[PDB]
């Protein structure tokens, strides 16, 4: 890799691993549409397995970007419309609070207060129905944004309903396969377990636990190589031959709502570039990213803006991931660590690296 890129990455990630005590990490910088890899530490401390470009990391909420794109693909295919009411795909959902709550609302966390987490007690299919039937909106739809798994997660499940495929099957056939993301999984097979890093929480090795809507909200695991590929596809959707997928990617980068200087897409969150570091850096901290905020509707949504900082943070008990790209500069970065460390530290490092490359 150009010594230029090598220097900036090393000078930035080395002190980060040191200060955040990250056991293992993999970084991918996409520069001029070409990827460059870097890896540090351990995937498995106990078994002394090093992190490699084949190591699988939990993407956590970065999985939401795949869901947003898969939903975008369904829209492109004419299977669903973001303007359709939620009940069109789940008629069993008869509670009157759902009146006026659309797929757009579920996809963008603006349904009216759906919670961040689906309760642990909610498992069966009838349990989820009851959960949603009983839920009480604190606000009218399309007024307030509250980041939530139960919101975009439901969107993912309903979105693949017409395809007749299971969420996982739809995701593989419609997104992973076409993009050649061959080491990206919702459920990692026995054969790949050897490459699955252990997450570390308070020094204990852990992996994400099963949950309702987990696949749709935070259950994807991937390698630094496949995530580099995921970035390139999102930086250049026109390079994709599958019409509906290409279109799906564009739809996920459209700006539907605005809060502060952030714009909500389907899974991805965007900001006008050049962006102010302190603004995306502090804007990422969970003190802001997860709070209740009023949103302004973008009527109609602004189609994907090439000059934007497109990104998403992701976390699980044991993992911390981050993805950010600038379509206009054919520039991007993927950071995958097996420790959940502060978001601001991720964004800060990401910005130092990309800003230094234009
Ligand atoms: B995501 O990585 O931000 C995310 C947020 C919350 C949860 C949860 O509480 O289970 C999973 C993933």
Curated annotation (Swiss-Prot):
Q: Which GO terms describe its molecular function?
A: beta-lactamase activity
Q: What else is known?
A: The class C beta-lactamase family has a specific amino-acid numbering system known as SANC, for structural alignment-based numbering of class C beta-lactamases, or else the simpler name structural position. A multiple sequence alignment was used to derive a consensus sequence and then the consensus was numbered taking into account insertions and deletions. This allows use of identical numbers, e.g. for active site residues, despite differences in protein length.
For this entry, the protein name equals Beta-lactamase
UniProt keyword annotations, A-Z? Antibiotic resistance, Hydrolase, Periplasm, Signal
Q: Give the transmembrane ranges.
A: none
- Which Gene3D superfamilies does the entry mention? DD-peptidase/beta-lactamase superfamily (3.40.710.10)
The way its activity is modulated is described as: Inhibited by the beta-lactamase-blocking agents avibactam, enmetazobactam, relebactam, nacubactam, vaborbactam, taniborbactam, zidebactam, and beta-lactam-analog boronic acids, via a covalent binding to Ser-61. Inhibited by non-beta-lactam, benzo(b)thiophene-2-boronic acid (BZBTH2B) and various cyclic boronates. Not inhibited by clavulanic acid. Inhibited by O-aryloxycarbonyl hydroxamates, via cross-linking of the active site Ser-61 to Lys-312. Weakly inhibited by citric acid.
Cellular compartment(s): Periplasm
